[PDB]
Symmetry: C5
Amino acid sequence: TVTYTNRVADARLGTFSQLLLQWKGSIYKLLYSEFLIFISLYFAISLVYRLILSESQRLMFEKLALYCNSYAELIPVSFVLGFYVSLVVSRWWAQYESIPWPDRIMNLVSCNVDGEDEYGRLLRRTLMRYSNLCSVLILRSVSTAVYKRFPSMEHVVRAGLMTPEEHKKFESLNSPHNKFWIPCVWFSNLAVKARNEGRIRDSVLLQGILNELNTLRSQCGRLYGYDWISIPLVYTQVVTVAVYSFFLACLIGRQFLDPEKAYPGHELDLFVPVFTFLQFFFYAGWLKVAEQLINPFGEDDDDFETNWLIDRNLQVSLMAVDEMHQDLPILEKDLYWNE
Amino acid sequence: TVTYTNRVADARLGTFSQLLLQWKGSIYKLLYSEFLIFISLYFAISLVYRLILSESQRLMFEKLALYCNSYAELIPVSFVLGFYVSLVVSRWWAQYESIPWPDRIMNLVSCNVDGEDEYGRLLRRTLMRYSNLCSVLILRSVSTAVYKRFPSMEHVVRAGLMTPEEHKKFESLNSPHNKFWIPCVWFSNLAVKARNEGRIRDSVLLQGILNELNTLRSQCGRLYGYDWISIPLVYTQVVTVAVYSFFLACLIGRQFLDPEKAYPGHELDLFVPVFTFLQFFFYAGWLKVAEQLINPFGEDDDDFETNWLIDRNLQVSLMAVDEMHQDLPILEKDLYWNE
Amino acid sequence: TVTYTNRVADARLGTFSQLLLQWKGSIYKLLYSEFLIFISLYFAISLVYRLILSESQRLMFEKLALYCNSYAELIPVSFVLGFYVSLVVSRWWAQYESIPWPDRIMNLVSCNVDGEDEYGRLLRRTLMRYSNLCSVLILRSVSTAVYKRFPSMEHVVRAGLMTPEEHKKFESLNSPHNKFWIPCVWFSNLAVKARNEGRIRDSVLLQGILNELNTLRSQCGRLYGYDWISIPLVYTQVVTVAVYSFFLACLIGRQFLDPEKAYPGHELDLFVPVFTFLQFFFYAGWLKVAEQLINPFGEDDDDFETNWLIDRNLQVSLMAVDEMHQDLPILEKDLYWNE
Amino acid sequence: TVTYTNRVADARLGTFSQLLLQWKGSIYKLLYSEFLIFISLYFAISLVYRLILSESQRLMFEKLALYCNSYAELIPVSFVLGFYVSLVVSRWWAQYESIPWPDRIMNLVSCNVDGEDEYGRLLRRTLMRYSNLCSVLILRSVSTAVYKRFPSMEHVVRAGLMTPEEHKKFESLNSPHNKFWIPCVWFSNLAVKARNEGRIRDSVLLQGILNELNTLRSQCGRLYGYDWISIPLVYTQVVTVAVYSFFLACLIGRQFLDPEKAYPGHELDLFVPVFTFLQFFFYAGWLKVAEQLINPFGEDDDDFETNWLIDRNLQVSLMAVDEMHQDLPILEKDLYWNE
Amino acid sequence: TVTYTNRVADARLGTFSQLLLQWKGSIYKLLYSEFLIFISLYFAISLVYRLILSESQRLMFEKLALYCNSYAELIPVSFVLGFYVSLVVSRWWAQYESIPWPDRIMNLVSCNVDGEDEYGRLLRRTLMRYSNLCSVLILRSVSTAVYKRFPSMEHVVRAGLMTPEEHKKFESLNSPHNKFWIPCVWFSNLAVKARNEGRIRDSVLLQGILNELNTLRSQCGRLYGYDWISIPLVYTQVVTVAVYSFFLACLIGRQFLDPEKAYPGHELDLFVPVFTFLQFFFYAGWLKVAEQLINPFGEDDDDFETNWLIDRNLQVSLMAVDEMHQDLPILEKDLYWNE
Ligand SMILES: [Ca+2]
Ligand SMILES: [Ca+2]
Ligand SMILES: [Ca+2]
Ligand SMILES: [Ca+2]
Ligand SMILES: [Ca+2]
């Protein structure tokens, strides 16, 4: 993602005007190629009109230019872009909040699974590693950056997320579907084993741990559902046909005709339409918003930083249930102590 | 569904322009017949205008064409399509998230119902099969693809979802309503029987299993509610009358009149209106979005893959509570082991 | 409600065009009287213009018709109808999901309240009957169809929902407010009595039953809140003044003036404006959507079927906690049994 | 509030047309003064134009009227009113659902706190009175009607909501912030005291009572948050500058000019513009919707009835935990008793 | 924030018109510099047109002014501002409700952690101080005002939120990420230690305390997610290019041309366009709404008062779990006591 939230905290004079001079993740980086194609086509048509055509051909081209200028209409294009980009942004933020965080399971496994010896330490680390693996196996299915980081399951083993005996048990389980649900079953079986051996005290603490497991499972299921069910293809083809029809009308209708014939609206020849190019930046950039956000797990400048998030979740989890189990600072009186 | 999420991960040059060359689930496959009817009517009217009519008849037709061209208005049609398609897409995604998944019940039944002998194995398998049956009995009511897969209850028996004694008990229960709530009562009675025989340890684990049962029941109730309560019929008839009135105005008002009489706006005869046909693709495709998504359990190219989802849920459930009960990999130290 | 969800499963050629030939719940049944009033007023003004008026009076009427045709403006009317109908449809679907279903309480009372003798049977039936009564007492307050079914509390007694001793206890309780909260207190007291006599085993099962009771109470409170707090009256009067002002402009501005005087836009006399009548069907039907859905508990063709839903809930509840208490089919091996 | 939900149940002929003849809470009562100011300014300008000005002054005024009529533009005003009123109505209904209801705590305190003697009776009444006080102390902060009912804390004591020893303990607690959180701490301490004395049986029932306490605390926190964080002032000033700029353009541009000079669009002198006044009612009433609903706890005709709701909550709570503790009707067989 | 909710309770005559005379947080304070730049550029171009240019240059400037006036189009600018400001306001209110409040943890820690001696007092104070620290460490990451209050962790120590031994333990924990999750692990370990020493009675009360801890952790995670994932930069650059293109068209197209040449629409020379400046206030202020609300934790007049909220939360928490532990008013009969 491109974070600029510290830049737009106050509403000063140059609040949003300073954001037009940025390159990374901007509208220019997304519209360079389309703008150069549009410039090339426009000045090609204009120079063919000025230099090649004969006089009757010029008259027919002027009539065609008036015909095409009658259909350059902005309002329904603005409608369909507004509703489509609203749908895309709603699904974008809805996909962000489905990314699973291990912290709620971390707080309970760090405290409730007892044992300051080796075995309870190993038990807590294995539980949080099973929680992180259940998230990595769905992020490598919904994202291309995580999939380029983990192309095979052996790359998941190399990273330390899965011991080779867990990989042998993982491949021995025979299922033709996506296997992101395997560690979230291993977690619950290990938690019940830990209770039956005497590490978890009562049933209530075990059921709290299992409820947070099911919450993380529902998060992974939401990510799977957003990846598997896209925005419909016809509703994307409608907005592209609309925007490209508007720009095809503006390629011909927005020419500068001959002023000696005095057409209404064509009394001046400027050789370069500034406002047509600004309308191009407006409409084509407001389509590129929806092009960028339709899959936020890719590799754009403003797609989600998911590899960083995997690294954070693994380090924080194994830090909090190993180095922070019953390791508290000394209970002292605070500054607001009355008596 | 038609998945193209891997294709639109990055915002390259040909991001959405490559989606216009696709056929399966596209706008062309949904607009072929309407477009051919529109082409036939338009060129019929145009050739009758050019070849059959006399001169005074030609003058009356030109006056009628100016009258009909005065009413080809795009802005309220774009309004009503925008709001209606927003409603349809909101209900579409709301119906996806109501499809029940057995995984939250699966995690708890795989671990908490004890017994490595035959009886506890049979008990866990019967519990997850009662959870899957409560979902299949509502998917064969809300969907046409699941109903063509399971036309009678005997087809549900053949698939292994229901033993014949369960079918005899199912038909002995006399109720004139939809019976999708029967296995979700059998589940809770079998869970309480399993607790009273000594398989489930405490009351807390039993109540956690029953809470996940009630969550799956609420999912099935949401699917029943979305199928039974449609979008109102008058609010669909409004958008169809609007779009067909616009196209009836464009059949006559968008003719190419005789240029020798020099009507304002009709100075050139091109024999084929490109921009009228592009406006047809835009408006008729933005109506076909709402036609396709108004019942996402049918048999379109972008309706929900529900038979696959039933097969997945059954295989994953019976795999996780039978082959994975207290079958864990060997507890080893991970790569991040400090001491 | 008018269900057509099986008709619009696929996006065929005649998907929505077949819905224009339906009568029950359609736009025609809602716009018959307004359309006949509009036709009568329009042709009255037109025939007075053609037959009664003198020539200077004709000239003044033509000037008035041009003045009124200058104000027939469609875009803000389409704005205010779009936002108002969006609010109405949002509240409509929000009121559907607040209707209470007894099934979550049914699953727990069918299993956890023990006793295969007469007393436990009577206890379970009394609990589910107290759950259904707490829903009927709010549906007869928010709906007119349920109120015509149950005009007095004696009609609730006749239907079997309330024994006469419960009616005596119900009328002995002195409160000047709506008494839909009485059976939801009787439920919790009977559940605690059932626990203290030895029927409910532990505290956890009792608290699960009471939590589902409070969920059904929150559902009834939502229905009470949606009925008591309407859409504001000024926001309905705005959209009616807007639509009726547009149609008052179209009564006079859309006349066919005399072609011999050659007004711009009035060069042809057709005697019947097709597109004005189609704009009438569009705008008046898109107002009738909001007229129909503003109270979905009435007696329209697409209001909620609430009497059927009460009958279903009562039959399913008393069936599941009496005939299905510890009455399970024989535990057999399924078809996917491995060993 | 103005309830008309029983009036608009069916979609008859006079469904919404009968709502235009109502006065209480209507558009007329909110637009009387603005409409009279607009009428006075308009006819003042018109009579100064007709009677006072000389001929060259008349020519300059006609040029100014054409200039101002060129800027009376309706579409962006309709945009900004639509989005702003959508925000106001969304926050309005969101503030209704945050009003706390004591019924979920009432069901649990009526049943779980044991004791048919004096002490348990006093304990249950004190618990529900602490629940109601925690709601009254935030309704007298967010509302002006509740604040006029309870101007000081002594008026809260007079009403019986707070005994004078509770007022002494309430004022002894020294905090410079709003003290609506004090009775919601007293509730939890009294509940734990009641458990430790033997009135509440187990820990599970105590934790259920405390969870419903925290739910009511979150409701009060939502009301505090909606009152403290208003809609931004600049986003209200934008819509008022837009609507008043449109009406300032219509004061001068919508004059009836001299017909003898034959301006295009001013060929008739009617002395009173009907459609300009109807556009005034439309736009000014669609602003008065947002003016009325921006604080729904005031004293408009369609603000929330909060004093009634406080009276209801207090009477229902003290009725249900005192007169209805273990006072059940006699368990009889219902009408659907099979055997 | 700027609170005016007490001012707009009723819908009087001067309800919103009195808000146009306010300065703090208004549209004037946000548009002063842009308005002066626009005034300077406009009157510079106008005086260069009136005094410097020759006659043929005047003719070319009039042609250029007609060309630029043909592109001053308001409707798509109003579209894109409406949808963008709707997104900004939705995220604004969504970020308000993610601010964590300690009151739900406060109610349970004040009652369930036993001990009226020194040790239980210190235990309850340390628990609520760990809850407040977990909120301060994320507010100093998402806000600039809290970060200017707490620039280093030593400033957090000075304020009494963290004792120096807790700071030594906090810096000994080695993690390269944001450490706002450390006190929410210390809380759960101290709660389990308090249960194992005999202060918390059962497992159910401990699990309720831990569930409210996880709820506050999810609140802090939501604030972190809204700060880290901004609105996309291209979707802000689109709306700024649109608004600045409209104002660049209005700088030249809205000039007052020479009336002696009698251009259509330029028949009068007023020297100052009132309606162009009002359209500037409308569009530029409706952009400044989105400029102000895009980061509501900054230092605008209508950003969130977060330092006050931190002070309130700390004082209320340490007041309620120290001075209010088992300190109840005397149980007296209320005014509604029957017998
Ligand atoms: Ca992307
Ligand atoms: Ca379909
Ligand atoms: Ca109705
Ligand atoms: Ca108000
Ligand atoms: Ca700000």
